[PDB]
Each structure stands twice: as structure tokens, then as C-alpha cells.
Design a protein around this nucleic acid. Structure first.
Length: 74
RNA sequence: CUUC
């Protein structure tokens, strides 16, 4: 729930619509960050596409770092 | 709901 970073840019590595999650690779540190469908801002509402550039916050989830408030750049 |  704690915000670790804000307005981070990254590239969607993959996002699986069957399982409802994927990973975004941060452009600043080159680390993958977990992203759940519920963390994506508005059929497949709340999805992102592989290869897309997104902007997001990084928070500390139960299981480590995850994306929050995932939107288009800007 | 953590590398499909």
C-alpha cells in the first residue's frame, strides 16, 4: 500500500487477459514490475498491450513491488 | 494476483 515511486515510465513486457496480470519493465531501472488488471485505469477494460509504453506508480504489495494507476504517458 |  506504500507508494515507492510515482510517474514511472515503462514498457509492457506481456499482459495476459486470461489470468488478469502481466509485467511492465521500468525504463529507469530495467526491472519488471507486476501489474494486475485492477491497477490499470480505464470489452477488455483494464488491460494493457504488449510493447505499449505506460506511466504508473510503484507500490509495495503483499508480494513485493507492483504497478498502480497505470495510464498512457502523461 | 508474481514471469503466462
Amino acid at each position: 500500500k506504500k507508494v515507492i515511486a510515482t510517474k514511472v515510465l515503462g514498457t509492457v513486457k506481456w499482459f495476459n487477459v486470461r489470468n488478469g496480470y502481466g509485467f511492465i519493465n521500468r525504463n529507469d531501472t530495467k526491472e519488471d514490475v507486476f501489474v494486475h488488471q485492477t491497477a490499470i485505469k480505464k470489452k477488455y477494460l483494464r488491460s494493457v498491450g504488449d510493447g505499449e509504453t505506460v506511466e504508473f506508480d510503484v507500490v509495495e504489495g503483499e508480494k513485493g513491488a507492483e504497478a498502480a494507476n497505470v495510464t498512457g504517458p502523461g
